[PDB]
């Protein structure tokens, strides 16, 4: 019955244009192909961690208007629980409109929407299920001071927190690196943090001991196809996590993958070392890099090695 | 029961998001509100005449999805005749991804779908009720061979042609200009047919002289809150027809108004000057800028002045 893994966050639908060129202001522009998908960082990773097995609940706000409603029903479809997944008629689900060009470079229009009018009243009525988790799972796409009280309320009942400062903004309120057990960022997000250039492993590391030293437990810089850098304050050297060449077909939500996978081995696998864990992580996200379409992309159990899901340590996936 | 005014031409599923600004290459930015509207500037025109009081037929394909099914009843609630509004499982409804900022400019990416599978074997069933129609009305939101072939037809009947070069295309097939007895566009549009800078009405006019040269019968540019200039080949004088002095809320469509109360007096009261209905078509297409979205803001002839229907 009891979820292991909530998630307090995003659902978005994405818009997706593709055209040949970016439009100017004032242009009108014919592009050649139109679709519709689930996104939102917050369900991309409940959607991740339910696919690995988790019993996860998603608590967001989308509208009382159809978009909202296949949202719901794509929540139920990957097995998550919409119990205090709530609809509003006082805004429309939030959405993501991109426009793509040939060479893949975008302009990204978001309007959070009702992800903005999930509030402090919302997450009390869920304080049943927040509480009785293993790890409560948050980002920066819903109102900042939820997300702040959702982590108040897991710390008070022993709940892991996993934070994913994404999008980034440069003066974080310091209380996300004090109540966050596990950081985890990428490198465009630790240079906004920190003001630092991530250019190499060496480098995540020097941004990631000054977000250590703002008061996180742990803090994981992702690095695309250089895997992750870690450290922790019991263990401060960082950690480089390499992960093997493999052909991308579409990297986007491949942080949402990792993170998804990574509350999936906290909530299931506490007694893996976190060097394992994040390296089952990268062999998850990279399996979400060699196909198209964000959640489409993000493996079930059935498509992976049983190896991934060893309850000892297992190096070579 | 004779529908007078005849659009071939494109509905869309309006995707608008309105934001503070608009977005660089690269960039991601946060707006503050997101809506559906039925779009397409076929469709657009085709409810402002209806709403105005027109007979008139709507000639276009949407999908067999649920925002084509969606359009189809949008078209009967305006008491559209739906007779050659056609479905397709082949592709979507149209889209149009709508960007608008607080000063009202915007950027729109269109993915036509359903619209570009509207053909000449489509139009032909339509040949009958085109021959009795006053006005035919076209854009260029589906293939640009089929909205000509709509234009012969209507030349063919005497039926009155009124043509929309939205969006514009730099190399637009002079057929459009001969077969077109009104010829109506904005100033962005007559900059991409001509080539010319419009940052005027005294440089619209130049823009239209162009237009009226390529062998156009009449030409009007649109120039938003400064209303619109208007020549022919009789008066090819360009001449300045101020618009009501309102409050924006939303541009969007305002065109589109404009060019369906056209269609609304070229049909119902052809002995009207130029001059006379483009006065009317201003004030009503200032209507639908005070409101939000396309058609949501077109007005219904019960809630116009009297004398727009006198005459
Ligand atoms: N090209 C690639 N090859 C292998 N693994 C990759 C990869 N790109 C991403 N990954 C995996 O996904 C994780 C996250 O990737 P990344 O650092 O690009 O985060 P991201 O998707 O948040 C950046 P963005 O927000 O721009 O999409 C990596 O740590 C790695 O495990
Ligand atoms: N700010 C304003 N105040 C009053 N009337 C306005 C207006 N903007 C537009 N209109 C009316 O709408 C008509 C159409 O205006 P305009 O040419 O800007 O529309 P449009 O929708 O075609 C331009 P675009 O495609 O760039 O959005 C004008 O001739 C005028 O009557
Ligand atoms: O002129 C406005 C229209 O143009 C675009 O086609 C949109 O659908 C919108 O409704
Ligand atoms: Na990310
Ligand atoms: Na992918
Ligand atoms: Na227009
Ligand atoms: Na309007």
Same mark, same amino acid.
Do not use: W
């Given at each position: 019955?009891?979820?292991?893994?909530?998630?307090?966050?995003?659902?978005?639908?994405?818009?997706?244009?593709?055209?040949?060129?970016?439009?100017?202001?004032?242009?009108?522009?014919?592009?050649?192909?139109?679709?519709?998908?689930?996104?939102?960082?917050?369900?991309?990773?409940?959607?991740?961690?339910?696919?690995?097995?988790?019993?996860?609940?998603?608590?967001?706000?989308?509208?009382?208007?159809?978009?909202?409603?296949?949202?719901?029903?794509?929540?139920?479809?990957?097995?998550?629980?919409?119990?205090?997944?709530?609809?509003? @008629?006082?805004? $429309?689900?939030?959405?993501?409109?991109?426009?793509?060009?040939?060479?893949?470079?975008?302009?990204?229009?978001?309007?959070?929407?009702?992800?903005?009018?999930?509030?402090?009243?919302?997450?009390?009525?869920?304080?049943?299920?927040?509480?009785?988790?293993?790890?409560?799972?948050?980002?920066?796409?819903?109102?900042?001071?939820?997300?702040?009280?959702?982590?108040?309320?897991?710390?008070?009942?022993?709940?892991?927190?996993?934070?994913?400062?994404?999008?980034?903004?440069?003066?974080?309120?310091?209380?996300?690196?004090?109540?966050?057990?596990?950081?985890?960022?990428?490198?465009?997000?630790?240079?906004?943090?920190?003001?630092?250039?991530?250019?190499?492993?060496?480098?995540?590391?020097?941004?990631?001991?000054?977000?250590? @030293?703002?008061?996180?437990?742990?803090?994981?810089?992702?690095?695309? $196809?250089?895997?992750?850098?870690?450290?922790?304050?019991?263990?401060?050297?960082?950690?480089?996590?390499?992960?093997?060449?493999?052909?991308?077909?579409?990297?986007?939500?491949?942080?949402?993958?990792?993170?998804?996978?990574?509350?999936?081995?906290?909530?299931?696998?506490?007694?893996?070392?976190?060097?394992?864990?994040?390296?089952?992580?990268?062999?998850?996200?990279?399996?979400?890099?060699?196909?198209?379409?964000?959640?489409?992309?993000?493996?079930?159990?059935?498509?992976?090695?049983?190896?991934?899901?060893?309850?000892?340590?297992?190096?070579?996936?």
């Amino acid at each position: 019955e009891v979820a292991a893994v909530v998630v307090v966050g995003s659902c978005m639908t994405d818009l997706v244009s593709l055209t040949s060129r970016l439009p100017k202001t004032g242009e009108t522009i014919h592009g050649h192909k139109f679709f519709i998908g689930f996104g939102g960082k917050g369900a991309n990773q409940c959607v991740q961690a339910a696919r690995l097995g988790a019993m996860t609940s998603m608590v967001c706000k989308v509208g009382k208007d159809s978009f909202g409603n296949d949202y719901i029903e794509n929540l139920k479809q990957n097995d998550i629980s919409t119990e205090f997944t709530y609809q509003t @008629k006082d805004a $429309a689900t939030g959405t993501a409109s991109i426009i793509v060009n040939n060479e893949g470079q975008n302009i990204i229009v978001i309007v959070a929407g009702a992800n903005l009018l999930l509030n402090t009243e919302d997450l009390r009525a869920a304080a049943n299920v927040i509480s009785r988790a293993k790890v409560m799972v948050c980002q920066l796409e819903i109102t900042p001071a939820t997300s702040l009280e959702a982590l108040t309320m897991a710390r008070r009942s022993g709940v892991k927190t996993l934070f994913n400062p994404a999008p980034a903004i440069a003066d974080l309120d310091p209380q996300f690196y004090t109540l966050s057990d596990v950081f985890c960022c990428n490198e465009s997000e630790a240079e906004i943090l920190t003001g630092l250039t991530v250019g190499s492993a060496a480098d995540a590391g020097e941004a990631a001991l000054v977000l250590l @030293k703002r008061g996180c437990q742990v803090v994981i810089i992702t690095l695309g $196809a250089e895997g992750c850098v870690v450290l922790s304050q019991t263990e401060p050297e960082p950690k480089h996590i390499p992960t093997e060449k493999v052909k991308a077909v579409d990297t986007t939500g491949a942080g949402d993958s990792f993170v998804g996978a990574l509350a999936f081995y906290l909530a299931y696998y506490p007694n893996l070392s976190l060097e394992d864990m994040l390296n089952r992580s990268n062999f998850i996200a990279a399996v979400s890099v060699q196909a198209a379409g964000t959640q489409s992309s993000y493996p079930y159990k059935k498509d992976l090695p049983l190896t991934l899901f060893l309850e000892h340590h297992h190096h070579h996936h």
